[PDB]
Amino acid sequence: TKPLDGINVLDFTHVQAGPACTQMMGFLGANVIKIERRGSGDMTRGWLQDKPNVDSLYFTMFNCNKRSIELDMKTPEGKELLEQMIKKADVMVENFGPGALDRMGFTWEYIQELNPRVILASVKGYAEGHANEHLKVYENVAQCSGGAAATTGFWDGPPTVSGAALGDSNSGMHLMIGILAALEIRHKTGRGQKVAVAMQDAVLNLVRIKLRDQQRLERTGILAEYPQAQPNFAFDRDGNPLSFDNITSVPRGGNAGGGGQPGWMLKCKGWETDADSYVYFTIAANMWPQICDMIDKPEWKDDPAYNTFEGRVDKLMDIFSFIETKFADKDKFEVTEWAAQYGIPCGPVMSMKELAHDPSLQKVGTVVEVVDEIRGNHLTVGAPFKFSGFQPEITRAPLLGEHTDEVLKELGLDDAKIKELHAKQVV
């Protein structure tokens, strides 16, 4: 059995955040009916297509395990169809602009009237009640709003976006938690709820560690493990040394560990020509003697200035600069194995090329080849949660309106009524 078998999702979502959520629900067995606009549908269909007039990889990688119906929702017959669909839905999911779903006659209060059991789940930019509640926010804007950009990158460079979808997919995964939580409470109350996740808040949740640091900084005036705390290492734009003397908000720390276990990104053989020929090396406290054996400096093992975090904290960059010199003639996989024979936490920067074609990730179903007989096969990311009694069955993304009549017949409409709806341009 799959977790969400028999869960009917009425899916209004577009682009990334909403569709990530509903696709992942689909992977876990939910019945996802994607409502799309007549003729055009989800904006991702035509977004950076790799072949003319074929749905893009943006669309296919976020819309597997879904059925598509075209619908003009601002028509009387379309609103009627929607009322029928809401009555059969367990969860409605949308990521329209604020007020958009109200404006086409479907307020939460009306939705409750139609179906007391339905859950209404929304992706928002800022939370309801926020001063900026009405600002449009997408991916990198949300990374900026939630504190990630300010704390990502280097002290002598700009705020930096993550390549990971901290705004979009992260918000979608957060909303999926909200939806599943609402399903849990419905078992007890018998009633549906409204649940919403703002992109700013999804980002903030993942930068909890930086709000820890902001309070530490306010309380103590220093973050001793940050590069700026090492005397005469970090320099500003003009060339002078940086310190916490004049830093009152969590700064960018380059490739520092971000917690209580210091680390850095270290060059390996080929770094000039291979952008991903690097490892990350972490100094775990219990693993310090093991590091001294690999690096071969046994003086440091018993030196109190070197064998304690508090001793090490004021010369982290000096130790990292040295260890990096030991990796100059070894590729990232050779450095990783050389550290691994001392049990040390060291790992390679995996390239997207490596990841896309990695045997292990395909063995465990995390990278999945989708059998798409219409467009040709493509890779996608599968379910990142692995269950003892269940395996996802990923099926290819729908053509625009491919399942319109199938879905209309399920509502109970006869073949003459379907032809009328097609002729009247509602589906």
Next chain:
Amino acid sequence: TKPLDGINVLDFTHVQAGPACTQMMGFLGANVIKIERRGSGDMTRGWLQDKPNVDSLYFTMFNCNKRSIELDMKTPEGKELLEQMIKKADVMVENFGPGALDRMGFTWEYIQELNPRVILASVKGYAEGHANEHLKVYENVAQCSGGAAATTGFWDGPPTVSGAALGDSNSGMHLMIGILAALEIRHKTGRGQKVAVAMQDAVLNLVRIKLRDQQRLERTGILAEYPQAQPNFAFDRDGNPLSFDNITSVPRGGNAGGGGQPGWMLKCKGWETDADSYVYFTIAANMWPQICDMIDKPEWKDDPAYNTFEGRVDKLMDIFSFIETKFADKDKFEVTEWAAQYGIPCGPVMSMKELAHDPSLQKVGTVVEVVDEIRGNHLTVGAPFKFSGFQPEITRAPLLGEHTDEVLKELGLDDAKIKELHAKQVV
């Protein structure tokens, strides 16, 4: 009333990923009993402390809504206590190293014997069956393993770690989806399941958009929305030109749009002295006329060299550069307000200082002042999902072993036999 009221969680978790998961379950009403090592407890207690001998903000911000019991689980008496606790639990959660729980004698097989309803939830570095399934992984190593580091930062710099916890907290939130999914099937089956999330997999899930890009790159040889698509824009450290002629794995694109429309991080008034005086500004294809009005370039509206995404490919970075000149005398908030007049997606880089003291985030319960009469009040991030039917009630993190006797009483032990366990150094 709350989604997880009456759900008993046996919580073995420590450090970041596991405790984030169980804390958020706590926020949604779960009864979380956190098992800790005697004397030292969860090592976050003593990491990055702001006051000597007070539990660190690292611990308190990850362990609200929990009770703490001290337990040596490598004693016959400890293992017997676990068996009793497992029988009362709905969910067991752990983020020890691979195999650790099995070596204690609590394999999934034996756990099922003890309690056929209980769900076992794990965070590990890599998935079971992966070549690296036995590796111990920390935050930035997981970012490196999952494709984030390789695709974050600039083309002429190193792979860059994200300030957001893509590895740890993100994995915890994913595990929460798995746990909630297992709770949903248990209503049908009456049986618990094992659910596991690999840190690599949680990262890769958020990097799905870069797997879209890898395939596009493999299929077409170019990513037209990336800075390197602009001829003579991007260069490596020795001045060699970077173009997609020689790029075979998704490159770092600086502050480019990712899964959003094209954008960039633009300087605002004060950028020389304020590290966070920037906005993110998006050039969405359907907003070009508005942008031309804003920056007073009417001649750009009807010029095919400027008015389509395709025409802008060879000059987009020049356009960003020119737009940025309009922000020289305006702070990030006035730039944001100006752009919002046109409906253009644009927003400020919010500093951690600005976020920690923002009234809106405290109004909507996303930043929360926790009442801690022992340690003094502190801020935390609350639930990122907002519900119509309930509000989290966040309560302070437990002192080490604060609830040991309280918890033992509930297990059916009386005063004479808990004293023996104290005596034997079991609790």
